[PDB]
Amino acid sequence: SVNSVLAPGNLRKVHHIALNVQDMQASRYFYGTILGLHELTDDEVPATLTELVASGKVANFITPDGTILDLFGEPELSPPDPNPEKTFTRAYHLAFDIDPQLFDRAVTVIGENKIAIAHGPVTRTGRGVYFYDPDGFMIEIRCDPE
Amino acid sequence: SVNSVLAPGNLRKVHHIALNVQDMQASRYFYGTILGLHELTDDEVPATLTELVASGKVANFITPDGTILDLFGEPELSPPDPNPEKTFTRAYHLAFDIDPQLFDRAVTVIGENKIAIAHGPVTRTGRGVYFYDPDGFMIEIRCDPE
Numbered sequence: 001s002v003n004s005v006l007a008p009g010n011l012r013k014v015h016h017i018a019l020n021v022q023d024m025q026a027s028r029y030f031y032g033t034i035l036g037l038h039e040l041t042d043d044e045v046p047a048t049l050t051e052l053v054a055s056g057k058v059a060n061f062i063t064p065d066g067t068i069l070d071l072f073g074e075p076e077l078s079p080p081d082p083n084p085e086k087t088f089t090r091a092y093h094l095a096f097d098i099d100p101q102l103f104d105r106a107v108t109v110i111g112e113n114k115i116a117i118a119h120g121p122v123t124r125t126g127r128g129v130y131f132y133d134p135d136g137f138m139i140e141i142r143c144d145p146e
Numbered sequence: 147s148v149n150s151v152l153a154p155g156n157l158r159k160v161h162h163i164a165l166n167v168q169d170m171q172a173s174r175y176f177y178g179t180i181l182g183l184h185e186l187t188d189d190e191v192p193a194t195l196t197e198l199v200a201s202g203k204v205a206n207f208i209t210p211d212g213t214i215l216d217l218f219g220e221p222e223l224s225p226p227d228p229n230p231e232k233t234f235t236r237a238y239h240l241a242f243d244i245d246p247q248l249f250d251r252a253v254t255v256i257g258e259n260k261i262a263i264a265h266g267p268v269t270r271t272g273r274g275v276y277f278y279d280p281d282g283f284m285i286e287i288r289c290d291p292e
């Protein structure tokens with residue numbers, strides 16, 4: 001027999017990407033304050049996460065197009081390896097798109113906030129810069145050609 | 147002095163999420179064939195990834211709204227832990243949205259393809275089901291209320 005499979009389009013979009021963070025406030029600062037992602041208030045999140053968001057156990061940030069970044073406070077968990085440069089299978093990096101005219105500002109923001117740059121910035125097609133978040137998860141900021 | 151920071155909206159969207167996979171074909175089968183994500187052909191990807199995609203070292207899949215899932219072949223890398231149930235900081239899960247009327251079909255597809263369900267399906271607000279990909283990275287398929 002032939003197994004049933006989903007058709008292209010059934011999975012309509014990426015609803016959210018979830019990250020486990022050891023230091024919730026350091027991560028809220030990184031994603032919300034420095035990177036500028038808008039945060040969802042307790043009354044805007046699913047009734048099932050209302051108290052968790054209220055208690056600061058979970059935080060939700062969104063891009064203007066609606067994609068959600070969920071942060072789950074896990075103070076007792078460890079990273080796969082203390083050194084973020086050590087690679088493994090599974091999640092590699094998460095990349096955000098930015099207006100080509102704001103790419104330089106992003107690089108400057110990373111610098112003024114003393115965030116170490118893992119790779120780049122690089123210019124080509126497009127431009128990109130890579131850096132690690134508080135837990136060692138790699139983030140990429142990139143833009144299309146002018 | 148006050149550090150410069152990005153304003154809400156600067157990071158306009160999630161451009162792509164990258165995963166490292168030990169078995170490229172097993173992952174192309176999982177994401178493209180079973181989950182139905184549309185694949186980008188070598189002529190549709192950035193000139194910088196043309197040969198990598200051609201050689202099968204990298205694969206790009208997309209949701210209909212444009213978000214890209216990059217798969218990087220890493221046959222020599224290991225997962226953070228062989229048992230996918232072991233948790234760490236950093237990436238937790240990636241969730242895809244599906245029409246509420248197709249949620250049941252998705253659950254059935256997972257079953258017919260003998261993919262073990264980590265959690266769920268659950269019904270509430272919304273519905274959700276969780277399962278691991280070939281490398282042990284957790285995927286969630288969810289939908290809004292009817």
Ligand SMILES: [Co+2]
Nearest residue numbers: 038039040041
């Ligand atoms: Co608001």
Ligand SMILES: [Co+2]
Nearest residue numbers: 093095140164
């Ligand atoms: Co990338």
Ligand SMILES: [Co+2]
Nearest residue numbers: 184185186187
């Ligand atoms: Co096509």
Ligand SMILES: [Co+2]
Nearest residue numbers: 018239241286
């Ligand atoms: Co989720």
